Amino acid sequence: GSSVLQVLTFPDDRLRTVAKPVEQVTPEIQQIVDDMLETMYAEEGIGLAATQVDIHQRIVVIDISETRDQPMVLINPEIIEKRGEDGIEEGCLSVPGARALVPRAAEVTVKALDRNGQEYQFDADDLLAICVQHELDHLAGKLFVDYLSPLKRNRIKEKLEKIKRFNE
Ligand SMILES: CCCCC[C@H](CC(=O)NO)C(=O)N[C@H](C(=O)N1CCC[C@H]1CO)C(C)C
Ligand code: NI
């Protein structure tokens, strides 16, 4: 009942769009959620933000499980508390092939709506907390390369442009 969507890649200006809150959790929103899950699973990857598939609403899906059967849906997520410092080497479906250390909060408390519009909240640490922060950055138009030096980011940009230089 769902489809894999095209993932935008840096330097696509649409990745800089700031997502709007979801107004109501309609069947249309649930279809977006389902398509985002399908898209996330089509690849090695543990989360996806709607911005990355050119849908500029505050929708995130996550599955950090090894078995890929523990999905989490975050509509209108808000980080309401941050604690501590952590940082791991991150990659991004919208910056394929690039990896870098990103300083993050170690722990976050997040409030969101689930796929059915039910409000909930959770405290996250370790990989879940890092993933949440990475995905919420996407909704703000922010990519992990924005934490890097201009030189490192620009070299990544040029390499990704070369890969798509014959598209369209
Ligand atoms: C780690 C912080 C959030 C990661 C989310 C991304 C997917 C993404 O771009 N979401 O916007 C991912 O799965 N990245 C993967 C990644 O960096 N992973 C997957 C598990 C943890 C770490 C180790 O490679 C790679 C395979 C692209
Ligand atoms: Ni990403």
Residue numbers in the entry: 0 to 167
What does the report in the manuscript say about this coordinate set?
Most PDFs share a common catalytic core defined by three conserved sequence motifs (I, II, and III), which coordinate a metal ion and position key residues for substrate processing. All peptide-based PDF inhibitors share a common mechanism of action: they bind to the catalytic pocket of the enzyme, thereby preventing substrate access and inhibiting its deformylase activity. Furthermore, our investigation of V. cholerae, which encodes two type 1b PDFs with 50% sequence homology (Def1VCH and Def2VCH), demonstrated that both PDFs are catalytically active.
To explore this possibility at the molecular level, we determined high-resolution crystal structures of both proteins in complex with ACT. In both structures, ACT binds in the same location within the catalytic pocket and adopts a nearly identical orientation and conformation, blocking access to the active site located at the bottom of a deep cavity in the protein core. In Def1VCH, all previously identified amino acids involved in ACT binding in E. coli PDF were also identified interacting with ACT. Additionally, in the hydrophobic pocket containing the ACT P1' aliphatic chain, isoleucine at position 86 and leucine at position 125 in Def1VCH are substituted by glycine and phenylalanine, respectively, in Def2VCH. Substitution of arginine 97 with tyrosine in Def1VCH resulted in a significant increase in the MIC to ACT, reaching levels comparable to those conferred by Def2VCH. Substitutions of glutamate 87 to glutamine (E87Q) and leucine 125 to phenylalanine (L125F) in Def1VCH had either no or intermediate effects, in the same direction as the R97Y substitution, and their effects appeared to be cumulative. Deletion of the canonical PDF def1VCH did not impact the sensitivity to ACT, but the deletion of the accessory PDF def2VCH led to a 20-fold decrease in the MIC of ACT.
